[PDB]
Design a protein around this nucleic acid. Structure first.
Lengths: 114, 116
DNA sequence: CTTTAGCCGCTAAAA
DNA sequence: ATTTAGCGGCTAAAAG
């Protein structure tokens, strides 16, 4: 350990959250994001995408935990948007009929920028 | 050391080229297995089977685009072949121009132009 | 050493 | 038992 972890990962047997948790433990040991990327054979962006999952704003976390959003990239785009305009993002999410895709999130961010 | 168990493993390690997966599907087809069953034995979709069987018999000019790394997107290959079956010379010409950028956006435009 | 833009893998549902 | 439609992983390049 964490060889089995890195191995399991390179065998794609891991969820996004498991990968995020592994990353969190490596950070807590003092490793840098960039060196974690190299030890698991992935990009720096892959590290950013998963670290985000460790500390989601509550509304986004609930959307992700219920399977209402399953696209990690979309989770990241919602968190980015949320950091700038949190009230409006929550309100967008608060409509339960609002379909969540890369497209609808792009329209949301184009509207908020604007 | 069984072939299909290995293919499953090497699949999940992303260590098989499209050509290797296609080759394995062809070997299963020649042993009399049905596409839909080959999908189930490797835990992939029937569509995945289609996409790869296509690579076993590519028209020469699409095969060149692929073998030469000019198109690496297996889906785009399949889209090129589909367009080609319908309107061969028009697809060949479009490919014969080596300036042509090849993406899904660009293939999609070609097909829109063709279907009218 | 995190964001945007986007290719590409894949399969759900459709044809 | 193919094809279209489009979601979703992973990242090069652009931005910081």
């Amino acid at each position: 350990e964490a060889d089995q972890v890195i191995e399991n990962l390179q065998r794609n047997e891991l969820t996004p959250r498991e990968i995020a948790d592994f990353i969190g433990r490596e950070l807590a040991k003092g490793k840098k994001k960039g060196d974690i990327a190299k030890e698991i054979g992935k990009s720096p962006a892959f590290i950013t995408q998963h670290v985000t999952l460790l500390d989601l704003p509550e509304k986004i976390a609930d959307a992700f935990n219920t399977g209402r959003v399953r696209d990690v990239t979309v989770v990241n785009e919602l968190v980015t948007a949320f950091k700038k305009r949190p009230e409006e993002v929550e309100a967008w999410l608060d409509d339960d009929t609002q379909e969540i895709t890369r497209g609808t999130v792009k329209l949301l961010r184009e509207f908020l920028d604007e």
